Amino acid sequence: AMIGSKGVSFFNSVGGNVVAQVTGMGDNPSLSELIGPVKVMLQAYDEGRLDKLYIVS
């Protein structure tokens, strides 16, 4: 799951599977935008699609 366009571009060049993206927070980022990708990653995790989750920062 991807936050920010730089990661989007780099991992599209690498060709890794990206399931979700959000961009354009700039300064003063909001949790409201973040609710989405975390929701879909949770959906993947609890349905068995994902077994462990890491935050990279």
């Binding site: 936050i3 927070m25 300064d27 980022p29 973040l34 920062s57």
Partner: protein, 56 residues
């Protein structure tokens, strides 16, 4: 919280990069000025040699 901390780290990294860039520009300016001064002296000397030679 991770997002906010990454934003703060980005700001710190940009500050450092801009300091480095300012120092690099300041280092480039003086070398350009030395080259310009060499050219400035050379042009005066060449043109005065030409003027003196032309007064045969």
């Amino acid at each position: 919280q991770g997002v906010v901390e990454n934003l703060a780290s980005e700001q710190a990294a940009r500050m450092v990069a801009m300091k480095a860039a300012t120092d690099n520009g300041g280092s480039l300016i003086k070398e350009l000025q030395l080259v310009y001064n060499k050219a400035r002296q050379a042009s005066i000397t060449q043109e005065l040699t030409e003027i003196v030679s032309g007064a045969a």
